[PDB]
Amino acid sequence: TADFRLQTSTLCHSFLLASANKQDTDYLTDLLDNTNIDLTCVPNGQEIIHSLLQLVGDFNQRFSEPVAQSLGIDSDKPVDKTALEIFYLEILNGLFEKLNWGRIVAMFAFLRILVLRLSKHGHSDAIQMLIKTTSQYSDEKLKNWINLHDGWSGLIEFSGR
Ligand SMILES: CN(C)CC[C@H](CSc1ccccc1)Nc1ccc(S(=O)(=O)NC(=O)c2ccc(N3CCN(Cc4ccccc4-c4ccc(Cl)cc4)CC3)cc2)cc1[N+](=O)[O-]
């Protein structure tokens, strides 16, 4: 088994890559290193990724640019990694006023939108910062709750699979 921070980064990388294969064009597989990521380290990791993909898709349909436009995530220009982090962390600090599995699904959904828009151009460093930022934020704020809910494995029963 692995520490929660490593389990959360491993699960963030596999959900982002799997979501990219879903896209008409996948840019992420080439621009990210999948050599040191093993979902096998995460307990029940495959079903967690399948569960998170089912839940994030239902979320994307239900809920459909103010700061993305400011941060130029859709630009070819190198981005401000420092500013996107404060904005992402603050956006997450607002989301987790209430802590439920549904709010966790939304955080992964936001990371998917930011990572997939960033991927069109090779902003690998920003995507990696965001994956690390999700991992650090989850270890600090979401870990006690995620732990008291069967862990990341809790998403498997929440999904209904
Ligand atoms: C059965 N089937 C026919 C219906 C499936 C229903 C409806 S779809 C859905 C709803 C919530 C989360 C995910 C998907 N499923 C469901 C229903 C409820 C729940 S829940 O009770 O556990 N959670 C919620 O109901 C919930 C959670 C978060 C939530 N948000 C709405 C607003 N967004 C906006 C937002 C605010 C601040 C910062 C960022 C964002 C944000 C986040 C992501 C994006 Cl992509 C864009 C903006 C935050 C999250 C809304 C509802 C979970 C789920 N679920 O797990 O899928």
Q: Helix, strand or coil for residue 83? A: helix
Integer Cα distance of 101 and 35 in angstroms = 29
Is residue 142 within 8 Å of 97, Cβ to Cβ? no
Residues 6 or more apart whose Cβ sits within 8 Å of residue 75: 121
Tell me the best of 59, 88, 95, 96 to mutate to test the pocket of ligand 1, counting ligand atoms within 8 Å of each CB and taking the most.
59
Q: Whose CA is closest to atom 26 on ligand 1?
A: 102
Integer Cα distance of 130 and 8 in angstroms = 12
Q: How far is CA 135 from CA 31, 65, 79, 140, 144, in A?
A: 20, 24, 21, 9, 14
Q: Whose CA is closest to atom 42 on ligand 1?
A: 106
Q: How far is CA 160 from CA 26, 47, 52, 156, 157, in A?
A: 28, 11, 11, 7, 5
> Which tokens go with 4?
């929660």
> Which tokens go with 93?
């600090």
